[PDB]
Design a protein around this ligand. Structure first.
Ligand SMILES: CN1CCN([C@H]2C[C@@H](c3nc(-c4ccc5ccc(-c6ccccc6)nc5c4)c4c(N)nccn43)C2)CC1
Ligand SMILES: CN1CCN([C@H]2C[C@@H](c3nc(-c4ccc5ccc(-c6ccccc6)nc5c4)c4c(N)nccn43)C2)CC1
Ligand SMILES: [Ca+2]
Ligand SMILES: [Ca+2]
Lengths: 289, 289
């Protein structure tokens, strides 16, 4: 059961155009929304839809998982703008990230130390924010980080591990997809995700940044990755990777979860390298922190 | 490992236009293929693609599962026309079914006894053919039957249970999606599919035809369907369903697999109701049979 509230948007206020790609729960479209942002008649938006064909259960979980974003207000986490819970299709309205996902962006360059570090700190800041709001992402990867008009990186789609719904197919136990090349040794073992395993994934994202989105554990099957990582195996250090990002990856990949830095500590160690602008928009320097 | 052969088509001979929907292994497109059919410079075709992002393993299994169709030659099974195994994307070229899948077609009418029976016999004939060629479909459903220009129904996509590959996600054990509302009590129990469980699914297809593609076990969750069917539970008889199709469903849904008719026996019992044309195109009346 979902209860409509102030986040509800009338469908006539929405138009959709081009497909942006299939995320968790369904297709994302570019569109236009009326009356979603302060002091503008209309805003270009991203609209995620749940198919008409989808079960009522998926449709409800879609809305409930998205509704966690009603509490979020961070420059480095993609904002929820509204919801359409009445009629078909069920829609989630979000801040439009016009340069798409970070993985695809990285592939397209196939950056400098200053730009690599700014991305790092932006991602860590969005994550520090979420973790402080008691939220574990569980699917931090470059594919789930997003790039804004001005190249600011923000935290995106967390739904992939929470969407266990396929319309006419059912997996024996009822479990879901797991992002094994981004997961910590302890999460591979028991399937629980924590603040500390998010930090593990952050190191993988830095590695993805440093290799321009190479496939983690490039030469190994999924079964081989499970074994390798659970036995303390680690990703190769990228070519010409600045020492600072190498140092960060290594701290993020401590086998023992309690020995990894927090996100606030990661930012703390690289704050001298950030744009002056970061002090005004980040959660790190905010009153909240 | 896939070994290229006579089914190989040069990529320049292929153009693709509109999306037809995501099947197993990937997106299907309408397109045009040069030199794929006898006595025509070009043929409108369906082209299924495997994404550039997909693993080499998925890409190889795509081709190997599709390659079973190289042995098939039946009017009531969608034909393979060619393969493009060199370069990206990996393509499977097929006979274009211009009215799309049977489920969507059924929804669009929301037929007569004569038309219902012709569909029945066409589907049973394609299935009789596959079963005689030692092939178990494992995913017979109206969504996986296809409608031709002249409204002839043919057997389509068998890949959904064979495609266990997600690019950056991995399901714990390694297993796949199962079509539980179309599966027999014995297949729900041990996950093995047979000739007899295909016949079970055929009854479900007849029910789908008779209800204009209602959802099987409409009011029950997936876990409730498992229990219900394994305890001998059966689908409600459709409103105004002619007795003949009711009789066929019931024979198809005998709890004991060995007590269901074969597909040849199903056709045998309804052959007086088929178009005279059926005798010329069917496997049933063919020399092969
Ligand atoms: C392999 N990947 C497949 C999907 N690809 C597409 C999805 C598309 C996309 N997604 C979003 C977007 C951004 C932030 C989100 C944050 C949360 C959720 C979410 C929704 C429902 C339930 C749970 C989580 N969805 C979100 C969706 C956005 C966005 N905000 N702006 C533009 C494009 N977007 C990028 C990328 C590559
Ligand atoms: C819920 N569903 C989602 C997918 N939807 C779309 C897929 C699209 C489609 N698919 C085909 C087509 C038809 C016959 C096939 C037969 C075999 C395989 C196959 C391919 C690779 C590996 C294993 C099997 N793919 C096949 C694909 C065809 C076709 N031959 N002509 C036109 C459209 N087609 C209809 C329908 C509804
Ligand atoms: Ca889903
Ligand atoms: Ca797949």
């Amino acid at each position: 059961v979902y209860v409509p509230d102030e986040w509800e948007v009338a469908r006539e206020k929405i138009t959709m155009s081009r497909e942006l790609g299939q995320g968790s729960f369904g297709m994302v479209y570019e569109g236009v929304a009326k009356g979603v942002v302060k002091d503008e008649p209309e805003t270009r938006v991203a609209i995620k839809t749940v198919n008409e064909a989808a079960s009522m259960r998926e449709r409800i979980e879609f809305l409930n998982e998205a509704s966690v974003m009603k509490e979020f207000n961070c420059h480095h986490v993609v904002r929820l703008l509204g919801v359409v819970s009445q009629g078909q299709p069920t829609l989630v309205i979000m801040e439009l990230m016009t340069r798409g996902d970070l993985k695809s962006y990285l592939r397209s360059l196939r950056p400098s130390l200053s730009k690599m570090i700014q991305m790092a700190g932006e991602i860590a800041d969005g994550m520090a924010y979420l973790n402080a709001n008691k939220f574990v992402h569980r699917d931090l990867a470059a594919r789930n980080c997003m790039v804004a008009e001005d190249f600011t990186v923000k935290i995106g789609d967390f739904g992939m591990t929470r969407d266990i719904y396929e319309t006419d197919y059912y997996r024996k136990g009822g479990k879901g997809l797991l992002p094994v090349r981004w997961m910590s040794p302890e999460s591979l073992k028991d399937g629980v995700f924590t603040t500390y395993s998010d930090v593990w994934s952050f190191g993988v994202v830095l590695w993805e940044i440093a290799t321009l989105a190479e496939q983690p554990y490039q030469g190994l099957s999924n079964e081989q990755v499970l074994r390798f990582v659970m036995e303390g195996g680690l990703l190769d250090k990228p070519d010409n990777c600045p020492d600072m990002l190498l140092e960060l990856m290594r701290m993020c990949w401590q086998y023992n979860p309690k020995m990894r830095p927090s996100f606030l500590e990661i930012i703390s160690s690289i704050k001298e390298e950030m744009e002056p602008g970061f002090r005004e928009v980040s959660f790190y320097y905010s009153e909240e922190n």
